[PDB]
Design a protein around this ligand. Structure first.
Ligand SMILES: *[C@@H]1O[C@H](CO)[C@@H](O[C@@H]2O[C@H](CO)[C@@H](O)[C@H](O)[C@H]2NC(C)=O)[C@H](O)[C@H]1NC(C)=O
Ligand SMILES: *[C@@H]1O[C@H](CO)[C@@H](O[C@@H]2O[C@H](CO)[C@@H](O)[C@H](O)[C@H]2NC(C)=O)[C@H](O)[C@H]1NC(C)=O
Ligand SMILES: *[C@@H]1O[C@H](CO)[C@@H](O[C@@H]2O[C@H](CO)[C@@H](O)[C@H](O)[C@H]2NC(C)=O)[C@H](O)[C@H]1NC(C)=O
Ligand SMILES: *[C@@H]1O[C@H](CO)[C@@H](O[C@@H]2O[C@H](CO)[C@@H](O)[C@H](O)[C@H]2NC(C)=O)[C@H](O)[C@H]1NC(C)=O
Ligand SMILES: *[C@@H]1O[C@H](CO)[C@@H](O[C@@H]2O[C@H](CO)[C@@H](O)[C@H](O)[C@H]2NC(C)=O)[C@H](O)[C@H]1NC(C)=O
Ligand SMILES: *[C@@H]1O[C@H](CO)[C@@H](O[C@@H]2O[C@H](CO)[C@@H](O)[C@H](O)[C@H]2NC(C)=O)[C@H](O)[C@H]1NC(C)=O
Ligand SMILES: *[C@@H]1O[C@H](CO)[C@@H](O[C@@H]2O[C@H](CO)[C@@H](O)[C@H](O)[C@H]2NC(C)=O)[C@H](O)[C@H]1NC(C)=O
Ligand SMILES: *[C@@H]1O[C@H](CO)[C@@H](O)[C@H](O)[C@H]1NC(C)=O
Ligand SMILES: *[C@@H]1O[C@H](CO)[C@@H](O)[C@H](O)[C@H]1NC(C)=O
Ligand SMILES: *[C@@H]1O[C@H](CO)[C@@H](O)[C@H](O)[C@H]1NC(C)=O
Lengths: 86, 50, 34, 194, 315, 24
């Protein structure tokens, strides 16, 4: 299979489009799904169509309380070397 | 006739001046030659690698 | 009528055409602009 | 209990560099061996002073490469800790209005938890759900005047006109307590009669 | 040619008193550009093929230096993986791929110069077309980005249709449609203006927006930031190749003529000098790419925050 | 007498073709 990123051997090219798994390049990813390994063009995302009009509004009637995490490094390990002994 | 190299040779469509032997690129690499016997310009592209 | 110049070690900047001929040049020791 | 790859990544990068530093103590760099007790106790100070220099140069190069890459990695850990210090101020000791700074949704509150070489924030946000459509107007015309909502939107369930607040559906009768007046009703485009 | 002491600006006293005030009686609508870099080109150097390069007397001698070349390839690969995450963080900030409706009834506002152009393979907009017309070797290789710029233009048009159709609701959850004039009136409230000032001046406000959008193309048809980036990299890659024709204190700089004019004991001495110089050049190159990529990352981080806070909300 | 050249006496330093390249 010929790609803008080179020649790929051992994976079959499909016509579907999934979320990217293993990045090949130039829009092509690979996965172990269909098994074996396949190629294709990643998916940007679903498709939502807002029913916009010059006098229409949507208003929510309920809510959800959600809680998510965020992880951040603050430090690393303090090391010392002794030039002469090394 | 002195120029030693490796690569694929291909028919050119450039036109040297009739005393110039080989052509160079920016960054100074030989990329064209003229065949001494038939006097035609040939491009020199590297060998597929990666 | 004839002239005689002499040559010295200089550094020049040659402009090459697309056919490969020198069409212009710059002598890099004339003045500050050069 | 069943995701900490950032922390893992950091904890790892450092070990891979410290191992590469020690694994260089066994290269010749163009000498007869890697041991000074093989170059020393096997040559004269006049000659051993050559084979030892080839090792000194290589080991100095390797130590200085280690020290440059640590400066470049510490400058990156520093920016992450500077962002964590700002999130502790703005999401834990306050309520933020910045979009997508303290979670995804509308920030309510945040809780910190300590981790091996970092911090985890638990962000609590509000997310609206279950929307309906209605029809809207910008203003209401009445007695030749134009009325605008004080803090809401005018909506219509098909036949009647109410005011809600914009993020939660709670309709109210349009009165002179939740609207205000400005002008006559022929300059706004979209006015309705009610 | 003149030499002078520079002026700092015009000078003016404010008419301050203890019971005087100044109130505005009109306004203008401004539009201004800001340009930010988000990525560099992904390059990869084969340490062994840059140093030795074909020859075999060189490879066994370079094998004596340990893992110097493995470190450099790791360093360059990390940089290349970071360039795709830069772009994912700036542009893939949207769940769905939103579309504008086939009408364009936006209250007199006209977005045609920034919506996508259906008569194109790339489907870029008119201003994105203006912006795109203004900006093998000795082991060197350029990898392609994971996202095509068709994909990037498709992310940007969806961010645009989310904003024009739902205001800021799609950045906090599901997109909730609202008419554009009413969304503009919500935004006038956010800056402390009362919302009839918008509805009574709708046509004038829409004309001012349209003229300011028209002036941007003329001001375009600037991008020196991105250009600077692009260049700073080509010029640093040209120096690495030019450093291969230097002897570094050997007889010559070409690994065959040294090798076919001396016998091994004699040639190994010169080949080690060549190796030392060529390895120093590659370390200089990689260290500067590491320092230059951390500057591009701080810029893509600022872009991600701007896309969140200025496009998905009101600041 | 003496006279002033203006831009005269430029020769091709050698073989090797070449195009648009402000070569030094
Ligand atoms: C708002 O949503 C909540 C769910 O988040 C609804 O409450 C659920 O109602 C169903 C059916 O009555 C129950 O099976 C669930 O146990 C309820 N959830 C919880 C967390 O108690 C609620 O009814 C919705 N309100 C409206 C007005 O639709
Ligand atoms: C070098 O010698 C060869 C023959 O040894 C010349 O070749 C001939 O080339 C011309 C092209 O102009 C043909 O029309 C003739 O038929 C060729 N002869 C043969 C026997 O094949 C060649 O021209 C010589 N080189 C130059 C520069 O003249
Ligand atoms: C708001 O009203 C619109 C208008 O009908 C609804 O959008 C349509 O929904 C149907 C069925 O899901 C689709 O087939 C149409 O393509 C939609 N778009 C149109 C007609 O332009 C929408 O479902 C309503 N929203 C809510 C929350 O009830
Ligand atoms: C819109 O909402 C109003 C509520 O004010 C609905 O009208 C009332 O409906 C109840 C129950 O059907 C009746 O008891 C009342 O007499 C109605 N009128 C008033 C003034 O309260 C109306 O049906 C709703 N319309 C739609 C299309 O749902
Ligand atoms: C809203 O109410 C006003 C006043 O009740 C309407 O104005 C009248 O419209 C009719 C029909 O066009 C005219 O014959 C009258 O002369 C108008 N009177 C005034 C004082 O303007 C107006 O038409 C109503 N709007 C709608 C959409 O029904
Ligand atoms: C407020 O500013 C606008 C300009 O943005 C003024 O409108 C202009 O007025 C002049 C003179 O009447 C016209 O020639 C222009 O065509 C108007 N511009 C537009 C876009 O309509 C306006 O008059 C100013 N003052 C008030 C009170 O609105
Ligand atoms: C949105 O603005 C563009 C201008 O940038 C309008 O397109 C131009 O319209 C004028 C006349 O109004 C023509 O002379 C130009 O040839 C148009 N340029 C094009 C088509 O590229 C466009 O009409 C405006 N949109 C609306 C709905 O009026
Ligand atoms: C994918 O779709 C195209 C449509 O143009 C078709 O020509 C092609 O055969 C399809 N590929 C496969 C593997 O079915
Ligand atoms: C030589 O150069 C001129 C102008 O640069 C060009 O038009 C022409 O095609 C070139 N080749 C010739 C004259 O064979
Ligand atoms: C909305 O568009 C309709 C066309 O379906 C038009 O008749 C009406 O006047 C418009 N109203 C507003 C407020 O733009």
């Amino acid at each position: 299979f010929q790609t803008r990123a080179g020649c790929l051997i051992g994976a079959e090219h499909v016509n579907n489009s999934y979320e990217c798994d293993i990045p090949i390049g130039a829009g092509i990813c690979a996965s172990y799904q269909t098994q074996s390994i396949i190629a294709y063009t990643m998916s940007l995302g679903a498709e939502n169509s807002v029913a916009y009009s010059n006098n229409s509004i949507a208003i929510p009637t309920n809510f959800t309380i959600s809680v998510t995490t965020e992880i951040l490094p603050v430090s690393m390990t303090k090391t010392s070397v002794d030039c002469t002994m090394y | 006739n002195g120029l030693t190299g490796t690569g694929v040779l291909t028919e050119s469509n450039k036109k040297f001046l009739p005393f110039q032997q080989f052509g160079r690129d920016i960054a100074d690499t030989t990329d064209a030659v003229r065949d001494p016997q038939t006097l035609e310009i040939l491009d020199i592209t590297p060998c597929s690698f990666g | 009528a004839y002239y005689v110049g002499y040559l010295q070690p200089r550094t020049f900047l040659l402009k090459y055409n697309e056919n490969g001929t020198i069409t212009d040049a710059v002598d890099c020791a004339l003045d500050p602009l050069s | 209990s069943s995701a900490l790859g950032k922390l893992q990544d950091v904890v790892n990068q450092n070990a891979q560099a410290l191992n590469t530093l020690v694994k260089q103590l066994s290269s010749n760099f163009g000498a007869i061996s890697s041991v000074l007790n093989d170059i020393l106790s096997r040559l004269d100070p006049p000659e051993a002073e050559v084979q030892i220099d080839r090792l000194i140069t290589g080991r100095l190069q390797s130590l200085q490469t280690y020290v440059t890459q640590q400066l470049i990695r510490a400058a990156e850990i520093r920016a992450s800790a500077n962002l964590a210090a700002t999130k502790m101020s703005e999401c834990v000791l306050g309520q933020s209005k910045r979009v997508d700074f303290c979670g995804k949704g509308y920030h309510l509150m945040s809780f910190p938890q300590s981790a091996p070489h970092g911090v985890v924030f638990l962000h609590v946000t509000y997310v609206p759900a279950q929307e309906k459509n209605f029809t809207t107007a910008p203003a209401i015309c009445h007695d030749g005047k134009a009325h605008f909502p004080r803090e809401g939107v005018f909506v219509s369930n098909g036949t009647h006109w109410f005011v809600t607040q914009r993020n939660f559906y709670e309709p109210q009768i349009i009165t002179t307590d939740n609207t205000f007046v400005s002008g006559n009703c022929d300059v706004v485009i979209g006015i309705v009669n009610n | 040619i003149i030499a002078y002491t520079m002026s700092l600006g015009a000078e003016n006293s404010v008419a301050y008193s203890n019971n005087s005030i100044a109130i505005p009686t009109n306004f203008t609508i401004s539009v201004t550009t800001e340009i930010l870099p988000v990525s560099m080109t992904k390059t990869s150097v084969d340490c062994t093929m840059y140093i030795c390069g074909d020859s075999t007397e060189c490879s066994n001698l370079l094998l004596q230096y340990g893992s110097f070349c493995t470190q450099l390839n790791r360093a360059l690969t990390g940089i290349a993986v970071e360039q795709d995450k830069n772009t994912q963080e700036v542009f893939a900030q949207v769940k769905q791929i939103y579309k504008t409706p086939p009408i364009k009834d936006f209250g007199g506002f006209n977005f045609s110069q920034i919506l996508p152009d259906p008569s194109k393979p790339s489907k870029r907009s008119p201003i994105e077309d203006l912006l795109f017309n203004k900006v093998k070797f000795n082991g060197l290789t350029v990898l392609p980005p994971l996202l095509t710029d068709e994909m990037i233009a498709q992310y940007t048009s969806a961010l645009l249709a989310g904003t024009i159709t739902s205001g800021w609701t799609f950045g906090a959850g599901p997109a909730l449609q609202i008419p554009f004039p009413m969304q503009m009136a919500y935004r006038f409230n956010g800056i402390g203006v009362t919302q009839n000032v918008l509805y009574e001046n709708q046509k004038l406000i829409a004309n001012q927006f349209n003229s300011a959008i028209g002036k941007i193309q003329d001001s375009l048809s600037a991008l020196g930031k991105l250009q600077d980036v692009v260049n700073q990299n080509a010029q640093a890659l040209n120096t690495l190749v030019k450093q291969l024709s230097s002897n570094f204190g050997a007889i010559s700089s070409v690994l065959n003529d040294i090798l076919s004019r001396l016998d091994p004991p004699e040639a190994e001495v010169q080949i080690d000098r060549l190796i030392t110089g060529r390895l120093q050049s590659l370390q200089t190159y990689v260290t500067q790419q590491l320092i230059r990529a951390a500057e591009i990352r701080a810029s893509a981080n600022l872009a991600a925050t701007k896309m969140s806070e200025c496009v998905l909300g009101q600041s | 007498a003496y006279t002033n050249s203006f831009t005269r006496g430029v020769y091709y330093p050698d073989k090797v073709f070449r195009s648009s390249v402000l070569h030094s």
